Design an enzyme around this catalytic site. Structure first.
Site, mmCIF file in Angstrom:
data_model
loop_
_atom_site.group_PDB
_atom_site.id
_atom_site.type_symbol
_atom_site.label_atom_id
_atom_site.label_comp_id
_atom_site.label_asym_id
_atom_site.label_seq_id
_atom_site.Cartn_x
_atom_site.Cartn_y
_atom_site.Cartn_z
ATOM 1 N N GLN A 1 3.123 1.128 3.362
ATOM 2 C CA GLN A 1 2.928 0.071 4.334
ATOM 3 C C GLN A 1 3.603 -1.197 3.847
ATOM 4 O O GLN A 1 3.823 -1.376 2.654
ATOM 5 C CB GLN A 1 1.436 -0.151 4.532
ATOM 6 C CG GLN A 1 1.046 -0.852 5.790
ATOM 7 C CD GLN A 1 -0.441 -0.981 5.888
ATOM 8 O OE1 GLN A 1 -1.144 -0.739 4.920
ATOM 9 N NE2 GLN A 1 -0.939 -1.302 7.063
ATOM 10 N N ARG B 1 0.844 -1.182 0.000
ATOM 11 C CA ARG B 1 0.000 0.000 0.000
ATOM 12 C C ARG B 1 0.876 1.228 0.000
ATOM 13 O O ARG B 1 1.747 1.373 0.854
ATOM 14 C CB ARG B 1 -0.948 0.052 1.202
ATOM 15 C CG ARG B 1 -1.870 1.257 1.146
ATOM 16 C CD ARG B 1 -2.956 1.262 2.208
ATOM 17 N NE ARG B 1 -2.455 1.521 3.548
ATOM 18 C CZ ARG B 1 -3.202 1.466 4.645
ATOM 19 N NH1 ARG B 1 -4.485 1.148 4.562
ATOM 20 N NH2 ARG B 1 -2.661 1.712 5.830
ATOM 21 N N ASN C 1 -2.204 0.058 12.813
ATOM 22 C CA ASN C 1 -3.275 -0.356 13.696
ATOM 23 C C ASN C 1 -4.608 -0.285 12.966
ATOM 24 O O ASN C 1 -4.778 0.463 12.001
ATOM 25 C CB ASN C 1 -3.311 0.528 14.946
ATOM 26 C CG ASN C 1 -4.189 -0.038 16.036
ATOM 27 O OD1 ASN C 1 -4.789 -1.100 15.875
ATOM 28 N ND2 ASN C 1 -4.276 0.668 17.156
ATOM 29 N N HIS D 1 -0.716 5.389 16.427
ATOM 30 C CA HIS D 1 0.221 4.381 15.961
ATOM 31 C C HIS D 1 1.514 4.508 16.754
ATOM 32 O O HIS D 1 1.840 5.568 17.284
ATOM 33 C CB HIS D 1 0.483 4.522 14.464
ATOM 34 C CG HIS D 1 -0.717 4.255 13.614
ATOM 35 N ND1 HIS D 1 -1.626 5.234 13.286
ATOM 36 C CD2 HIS D 1 -1.165 3.118 13.033
ATOM 37 C CE1 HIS D 1 -2.579 4.713 12.534
ATOM 38 N NE2 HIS D 1 -2.323 3.431 12.367
ATOM 39 N N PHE E 1 1.849 10.372 1.962
ATOM 40 C CA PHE E 1 1.330 10.092 3.291
ATOM 41 C C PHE E 1 2.011 8.898 3.945
ATOM 42 O O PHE E 1 2.708 9.093 4.942
ATOM 43 C CB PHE E 1 -0.183 9.890 3.196
ATOM 44 C CG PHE E 1 -0.873 9.760 4.515
ATOM 45 C CD1 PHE E 1 -1.094 10.868 5.309
ATOM 46 C CD2 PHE E 1 -1.344 8.533 4.942
ATOM 47 C CE1 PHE E 1 -1.752 10.748 6.514
ATOM 48 C CE2 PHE E 1 -2.000 8.405 6.147
ATOM 49 C CZ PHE E 1 -2.205 9.515 6.932
ATOM 50 N N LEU F 1 -2.152 10.966 12.490
ATOM 51 C CA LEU F 1 -1.838 9.666 13.047
ATOM 52 C C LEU F 1 -1.267 9.747 14.451
ATOM 53 O O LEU F 1 -0.941 8.703 15.023
ATOM 54 C CB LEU F 1 -0.848 8.948 12.142
ATOM 55 C CG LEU F 1 -1.378 8.714 10.736
ATOM 56 C CD1 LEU F 1 -0.308 8.114 9.852
ATOM 57 C CD2 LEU F 1 -2.593 7.830 10.786
ATOM 58 N N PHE G 1 4.656 0.556 8.706
ATOM 59 C CA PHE G 1 4.681 1.477 7.583
ATOM 60 C C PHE G 1 5.716 2.561 7.792
ATOM 61 O O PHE G 1 5.983 2.981 8.918
ATOM 62 C CB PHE G 1 3.310 2.114 7.335
ATOM 63 C CG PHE G 1 2.774 2.924 8.474
ATOM 64 C CD1 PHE G 1 1.997 2.336 9.446
ATOM 65 C CD2 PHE G 1 2.975 4.290 8.525
ATOM 66 C CE1 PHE G 1 1.483 3.087 10.474
ATOM 67 C CE2 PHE G 1 2.462 5.042 9.545
ATOM 68 C CZ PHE G 1 1.718 4.443 10.519
#
Ligand SMILES: [Mg+2]
Ligand SMILES: [Zn+2]
Ligand SMILES: [Zn+2]
Ligand SMILES: [Zn+2]
Ligand SMILES: [Zn+2]
Lengths: 138, 175, 170, 56
Positions: free
Chosen positions: B63, B55, B102, B126, B60, B122, B113
């Site tokens: 992952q 991903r 998460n 996380h 941003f 975030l 990530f």
RNA sequence: AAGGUAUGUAUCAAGCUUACAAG
RNA sequence: UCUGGUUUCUCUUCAGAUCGCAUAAAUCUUUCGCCUUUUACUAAAGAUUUCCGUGGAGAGGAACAACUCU
């Protein structure tokens, strides 16, 4: 972890150290977790609860069981793993299942009295499931 | 000077050789112990070999750590998922940060990530457990190619071909 | 691909910047205080010598000057947002204080810094298919027999009643 | 020593279990500094010893 | 630091305020 | 043979002492000095306070207090 006595501590500290490390890790978890949902003062009950159980572990390990010697007991107090004060109220007669020191202070309370944690439940009224607002329960 | 590094010092480093190059993630072992223990344990198992980066939200995050490649398969070395480990000096203000991924509550597995920019949405969601040593942040900016084909998962994602452990605190064994 | 140096020592300083040195001016041995100190010293050593003309340098023929900065102090910086601009002469062209006004006399309404910051964060007659869509003088594409029946209705157009004048084309 | 927009460091998760480095501690030798040696670098030096000090 | 870029009105929320008396 | 008490915590007035082997800030009244006016100021005198501390005294415990000064 801070030890603040440079001692190379006496024996047998090695057999209580994993226990006390577990209680310190649980006290960090009970110190760090958020306060949302937990209302205002039930978010500070668990630090009194785990402080109680840490002082009680050293308490019944020394006076009751007589496993640890006197020197390591005084060491565990003088470091910080116990109360010097709350074992002195555990040694006295009528009260050694005590919650913590806030239910003995008679001027923390506004009416000049001891909290209702410290009332014999047999002689209180039958069903009220009151938890002390300072210390956590009885 | 006036520049002020403004984040706690690291301990323990893992070099990690993907097809985009070599990335040397260095860990905040003291500030986030269970997640760093998870990551060096899995890298020491060679759990992450041939694992893809499935991903990419360019700008941003990117992952990885899904050996099934769909976005849900992660098996920690705790059996159950473990707890989030936040810190007030570890925040998502910059690129190069590495954080467990998460799905809500204390659910941290292998799936982690990189960040690619500023990620203030975030914060306190996380567990940051490592930064990337500079001159190799560009190898993980190679991972952000605009090839995404979808909202996620480009054509040929980079796979992790090896995973070294350059420094190992807190003694372990693999399985 | 930038290959790593592959060593376990972390990326930066050991003190994590707690001795950051502020090295934006001329360094200690070449600084003008040190040149002054050199001149002072060498004029103290040569005292019994009387014009031995070995010349020694420019200054030394016989702590002020550019003064040294404290290396161990970052200066606390603000922004002086508040501009000195006559509000009058900016938006009117006339200050009642003349040239005695203590402000600038500028007339440029360029944006401030904080303003740039807080923008920086943000057929059709019969309505059928085109059955020979065919034209008149003036762009009017109609269907063929339908516009013939339209001429049977009215000799001028439907769009703007322009004179078709009999003229009808594809 | 700390930048602005950095909240002052939260003594629970930052330096609680961090051990301190070392104090100054000029090394005293025995056979000349023998009386003061046991207590000379201590917060209140003789505090719980009724021979030398008042009390607590 | 004040002493200069006026103050005075009319509609439109958070800040702050009690979490109360009550058929 | 009998007589038989240091710590630590709270109150209780008295302080006349380098209460402090050192030393803050304020108010008032005058003279200074910078000054344009006012607070920020200056640096001397006089008289007052506040504040950071201390000394001796009554009481209440608790802390080995029963070791023993006596
Ligand atoms: Mg006036
Ligand atoms: Zn209780
Ligand atoms: Zn309690
Ligand atoms: Zn209670
Ligand atoms: Zn003007």
């Amino acid at each position: 972890k801070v030890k603040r006595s440079r001692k190379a501590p006496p024996d047998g500290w090695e057999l209580i150290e994993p226990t006390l490390d577990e209680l310190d890790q649980k006290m960090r978890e009970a110190e760090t977790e958020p306060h949302e949902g937990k209302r205002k003062v039930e978010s500070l009950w668990p630090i009194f609860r785990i402080h109680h159980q840490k002082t009680r572990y050293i308490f019944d390990l020394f006076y009751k069981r007589k496993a640890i010697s006197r020197e390591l007991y005084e060491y565990c107090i003088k470091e910080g793993y116990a109360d010097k004060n709350l074992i002195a109220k555990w040694k006295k007669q009528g009260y050694e299942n005590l919650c913590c020191l806030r239910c003995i202070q008679t001027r923390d309370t506004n009416f000049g009295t001891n909290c209702i944690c410290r009332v014999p439940k047999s002689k209180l009224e039958v069903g009220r499931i009151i938890e002390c607002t300072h210390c956590g329960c009885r | 000077s006036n520049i002020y590094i403004q984040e706690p010092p690291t301990n323990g480093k893992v070099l990690l050789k993907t097809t985009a190059g070599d990335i040397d993630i260095e860990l905040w072992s003291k500030e986030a112990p269970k997640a760093c223990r998870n990551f060096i344990q899995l890298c020491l198992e060679a759990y992450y070999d041939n694992t893809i980066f499935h991903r990419v939200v360019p700008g941003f995050i990117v992952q990885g750590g899904d050996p099934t490649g769909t976005g849900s398969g992660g098996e920690s070395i705790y059996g159950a998922p473990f707890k989030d480990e936040f810190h007030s000096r570890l925040r998502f203000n910059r690129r190069g940060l590495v954080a467990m991924a998460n799905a809500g509550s204390h659910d941290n597995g292998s799936q982690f990530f990189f960040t690619l920019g500023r990620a203030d949405e975030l914060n306190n969601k996380h567990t940051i457990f490592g930064k990337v040593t500079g001159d190799t942040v560009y190898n993980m900016l190679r991972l952000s190619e605009v090839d995404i084909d979808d909202d996620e998962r480009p054509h040929n994602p980079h796979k992790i071909k090896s995973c070294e452990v350059l420094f190992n605190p807190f003694d372990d064994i693999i399985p | 691909v930038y290959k790593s140096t592959r060593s376990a020592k972390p990326v930066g300083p050991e003190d994590m910047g707690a001795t950051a040195v502020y090295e934006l001016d001329t360094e200690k041995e070449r600084d003008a205080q040190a040149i002054f100190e050199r001149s002072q010293k060498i004029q103290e050593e040569l005292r019994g010598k009387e014009d031995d003309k070995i010349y020694r340098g420019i200054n030394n023929y016989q702590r002020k000057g550019p003064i040294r900065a404290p290396e161990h102090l970052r200066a606390t910086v603000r922004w002086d947002y508040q501009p000195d601009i006559c509000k009058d002469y900016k938006e009117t062209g006339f200050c009642g204080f003349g040239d005695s006004c203590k402000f600038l006399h500028d007339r440029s309404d360029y944006k401030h810094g904080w303003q740039i910051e807080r923008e920086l964060d943000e057929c059709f007659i019969c309505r059928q298919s085109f059955q020979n869509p065919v034209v008149t003088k003036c762009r009017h594409y109609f269907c063929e027999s339908c516009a013939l029946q339209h001429f049977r209705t009215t000799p001028r157009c439907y769009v703007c009643d322009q004179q078709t004048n009999g003229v009808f084309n594809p | 020593p700390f930048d602005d927009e950095e909240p002052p460091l939260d003594y629970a998760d930052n330096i609680l279990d961090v051990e301190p480095l070392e104090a100054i501690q000029l090394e005293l030798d025995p056979e000349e500094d023998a009386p003061v040696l046991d207590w000379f670098y201590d917060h209140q030096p003789l505090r719980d010893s009724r021979k030398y000090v008042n009390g607590s």
